């Protein structure tokens, strides 16, 4: 019954127990309860990047294989933009850092810098939307520091997530402006259409999002009773379990009750809700309740004699533990679908609050490591010098003293505090220059 | 301009020239014009198998890896059915027979034989629907002979296609009833829920469909001018090309014309039609017409001064070469979408007619090899003995005399002729037994 470790006490053991008991992985094989999430991501993110104008393709490091073809295909300005995406499998913590995983990576080349920069952020919005709209996970959109960007590019943009149980940042996905670096390496060039004396190099970007989203989702929403599945990616959204069946239930009445479960299932599915029944009567209803609790099914309908007689469903909401009575009539599928949208909203809100609570604005060095030790991320004033970023990570690792304990930069958030950074000195110990921005620091995955 | 070999004269060179000039493959890399087809298949077939109740998953020969897990997961009858699908890439003629390709394969295990048999045919209907409804390719649904089935199973069902240019059958996809063979190998078992003294073995099936569908599609519909893309899988369904622009076109009038192309594009896309413009004016309109002809864009809109003035689009239909005038007004997107549905219908009809014309019912041995040599498939009476099937292939190979020349069985069609087989002797040379069925024979891919 339940889960063998609390998140607050032993997070690694909690996570392994959850992913196993919820039937997400088999020691990895990705079983359907987890895979459905990836299928949802593929549909949703796939749709968005198609709609932007990116096309899918299949290639048998991606850049070393692809960019020679880009050179070949770009014969003149009329071949631009080249905008290609691939869904594939790249070759440990399951769904966080693994030897094999699935992802999507896009590579584009444009005639102008503006075009390339604009797509970089469009794609980042898509990734943000994945986390927020599908997975109910809040993110920080921002830009990586020089130190933390993708080495082959000009700048890297990111959606940074927060793992409360361990007080660590996790990079959610990234979108890179590669500028003209790679065109120079791979001899990607075209004649300027307005001046045939001159050769230009396209502006390239690349961007990827992987099954890491699933691990983030688990870590963000799971609780001490098990997984809590965001409803938009829950393979089963509602489980229907018969209750109140005893020694003295007549066969007429037992049949009716089971039949009503099937009927309910049918009515919900016809209304678009992913419902199913659990009619394994060799297990108690309690055992069945636990099984689906651990999986994180968003809603459980307990259908007994009185629910039948009163045409009134008893609904247990997994994330909140709340209980609702929902009328069983023509409006039931819409009502349940609305309750699933509220569930999304509430899960997102609760996670966002937790995130913001654990984002701590630190202006004095002496409070930096104690803040980390409170399992918080830190927003601190920074002058922008790499040396200062390096000193923060060194000094924080040395004061803290098997995961890393030094704090790195996570991103420079696009949404900056109202409080001006310029009023403060750069955060590093002994530093004196006026800050120019706030940057988000933390211990990280 | 155009294609360098006729289908009727050198089919291999024709096919290579098409797939290259239509930008389908790069020597394979699957470029978007072809990949979009696979994306369409994934959506359509994916949807159907989800709706049947199959779930997707990810495993790092599939049976040797998967079936031990099936043994593990099936702890009792309450774990059945296990119904799992994977979209992945397995490791020459591009899209026909290649070292690497993409496919989908499903593996199910059920408690009862009836359940397993029923799904086998449901899945086969899905595959038939792929070819027919997406790709406008006709098929023969049938059962493989004992000799031609998947060796590990009890029986194999198939959708067989016909390649007219070379007079050969091509297996389109297969769905296998594996019975209890594999459960015995892999110790997949459960206690009979109605008798706990007894152990039962589940009934399994497996089924796959690959990017071979794309090669079949090309071979079936392509003509001597290039590819002809079925409209439901055409990445671009309508191409808009400006025409009638001369030395003396004023800049006011050139701007208006280009703007009207963009506007048309916008109006069609808003109505659900995949339209785009080709405004590369460094090429003649003729050159542009050829380029999209070779790619097989279903409809071309030629938008000139008079089309603008008369609010009347000149539409060239790729498969038929027909020309239509389509009014440019509020109804244009629906009208064009309807014309694209007619295009689907017509392509399917023309291919079906060709197929049926080349299906020849042969009752005398002496006409068998000459029929093959007419680039036809053959429906012939068969007693059902493997020996007779073997003799047909031997005798046909010996009389015909670098592809194979012997005829194999393709399938026993579920749709049998009205003419009773029993009226005839088995087809093989010298054979004497009354036939029990008609079977489809041919030279094959
Ligand atoms: Mg730089
Ligand atoms: Mg905390
Ligand atoms: Mg200060
Ligand atoms: Mg047998
Ligand atoms: Mg012929
Ligand atoms: Mg006879
Ligand atoms: Zn500084
Ligand atoms: Zn015979």
UniProtKB/TrEMBL annotation, chains A, B:
<keyword id="KW-0067">ATP-binding</keyword>
<dbReference type="GO" id="GO:0006433">
    <property type="term" value="P:prolyl-tRNA aminoacylation"/>
</dbReference>
<feature type="binding site">
    <location>
        <position position="164"/>
    </location>
    <ligand>
        <name>Mg(2+) 1</name>
    </ligand>
</feature>
<feature type="binding site">
    <location>
        <position position="383"/>
    </location>
    <ligand>
        <name>Zn(2+)</name>
    </ligand>
</feature>
<feature type="binding site">
    <location>
        <position position="358"/>
    </location>
    <ligand>
        <name>Mg(2+) 1</name>
    </ligand>
</feature>
<feature type="binding site">
    <location>
        <position position="425"/>
    </location>
    <ligand>
        <name>Mg(2+) 2</name>
    </ligand>
</feature>
<dbReference type="GO" id="GO:0002161">
    <property type="term" value="F:aminoacyl-tRNA deacylase activity"/>
</dbReference>
<feature type="domain" description="Aminoacyl-transfer RNA synthetases class-II family profile">
    <location>
        <begin position="41"/>
        <end position="230"/>
    </location>
</feature>
<keyword id="KW-0030">Aminoacyl-tRNA synthetase</keyword>
<feature type="binding site">
    <location>
        <position position="388"/>
    </location>
    <ligand>
        <name>Zn(2+)</name>
    </ligand>
</feature>
<dbReference type="GO" id="GO:0005737">
    <property type="term" value="C:cytoplasm"/>
</dbReference>
<dbReference type="GO" id="GO:0046872">
    <property type="term" value="F:metal ion binding"/>
</dbReference>
<keyword id="KW-0547">Nucleotide-binding</keyword>
<dbReference type="GO" id="GO:0017101">
    <property type="term" value="C:aminoacyl-tRNA synthetase multienzyme complex"/>
</dbReference>
<keyword id="KW-0436">Ligase</keyword>
<dbReference type="GO" id="GO:0004827">
    <property type="term" value="F:proline-tRNA ligase activity"/>
</dbReference>
<feature type="disulfide bond">
    <location>
        <begin position="428"/>
        <end position="431"/>
    </location>
</feature>
<keyword id="KW-0648">Protein biosynthesis</keyword>
<feature type="binding site">
    <location>
        <position position="364"/>
    </location>
    <ligand>
        <name>Mg(2+) 2</name>
    </ligand>
</feature>
<feature type="binding site">
    <location>
        <position position="426"/>
    </location>
    <ligand>
        <name>Zn(2+)</name>
    </ligand>
</feature>
<keyword id="KW-0479">Metal-binding</keyword>
<keyword id="KW-0862">Zinc</keyword>
<protein>
    <recommendedName>
        <fullName>proline--tRNA ligase</fullName>
        <ecNumber>6.1.1.15</ecNumber>
    </recommendedName>
</protein>
<dbReference type="GO" id="GO:0005524">
    <property type="term" value="F:ATP binding"/>
</dbReference>
């Amino acid at each position: 019954m339940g889960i063998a470790a609390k998140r607050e006490e032993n997070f690694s053991a909690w996570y392994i127990d959850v992913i196993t008991k919820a039937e997400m992985i088999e020691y990895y094989i990705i079983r359907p309860w987890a895979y459905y999430v990836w299928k949802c991501v593929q549909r949703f993110l796939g749709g968005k990047i198609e709609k932007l104008g990116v096309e899918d393709c299949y290639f048998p490091t991606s850049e070393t294989v692809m960019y020679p073809y880009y050179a070949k295909w770009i014969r003149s300005h009329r071949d631009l933009p080249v905008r290609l995406n691939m869904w594939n499998n790249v070759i440990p913590t399951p769904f966080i850092r693994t030897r094999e995983f699935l992802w999507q990576e896009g590579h584009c080349a444009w005639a102008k810098a503006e075009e390339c920069a604009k797509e970089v952020l469009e794609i980042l919005e898509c990734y943000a939307s994945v986390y927020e709209q599908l997975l109910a996970v809040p993110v920080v959109r921002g830009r990586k520091t020089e130190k933390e960007k993708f080495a082959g590019g000009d700048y890297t943009t990111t959606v940074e997530t927060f793992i409360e149980a361990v007080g660590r940042g996790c990079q959610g996905a990234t979108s890179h402006n590669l500028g003209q670096n790679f065109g120079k390496m791979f001899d990607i060039r075209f004649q300027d259409p307005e001046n045939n004396e001159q050769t230009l190099i396209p502006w390239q970007n690349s961007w990827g999002l992987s099954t890491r989203v699933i691990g983030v989702m688990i870590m963000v929403h799971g609780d001490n009773r098990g997984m809590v599945m965001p409803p938009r990616v829950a393979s089963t959204q509602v489980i229907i379990i018969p209750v109140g069946i005893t020694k003295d239930t007549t066969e007429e009445a037992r049949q009716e009750l089971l039949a009503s479960c099937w009927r309910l299932e049918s009515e919900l599915c016809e209304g678009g809700v992913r419902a199913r029944c659990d009619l394994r009567d060799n297990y108690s209803p309690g055992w069945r309740f636990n099984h689906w609790e651990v999986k994180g099914v968003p809603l459980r309908v307990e259908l007994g004699p009185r629910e039948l007689a009163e045409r009134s469903l008893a609904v247990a909401v997994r994330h909140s533990g709340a209980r609702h009575s929902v009328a069983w009539d023509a409006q039931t599928p819409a009502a349940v679908a609305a309750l699933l949208e509220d569930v999304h909203a509430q899960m997102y809100a609760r996670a966002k609050e937790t995130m913001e609570t654990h984002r701590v604005r630190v202006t004095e060095w002496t409070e930096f490591v104690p803040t980390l030790n409170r399992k918080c991320l830190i927003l601190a004033p920074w002058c922008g010098a790499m040396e200062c970023e390096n000193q923060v990570k060194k000094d924080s690792a040395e004061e803290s003293k098997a995961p890393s304990m030094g704090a790195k930069t996570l991103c420079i958030p696009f949404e900056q505090p109202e409080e001006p950074a310029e009023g403060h000195e750069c955060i590093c110990k002994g530093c004196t220059k006026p800050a120019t921005t706030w940057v988000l620091f933390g211990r990280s995955y």
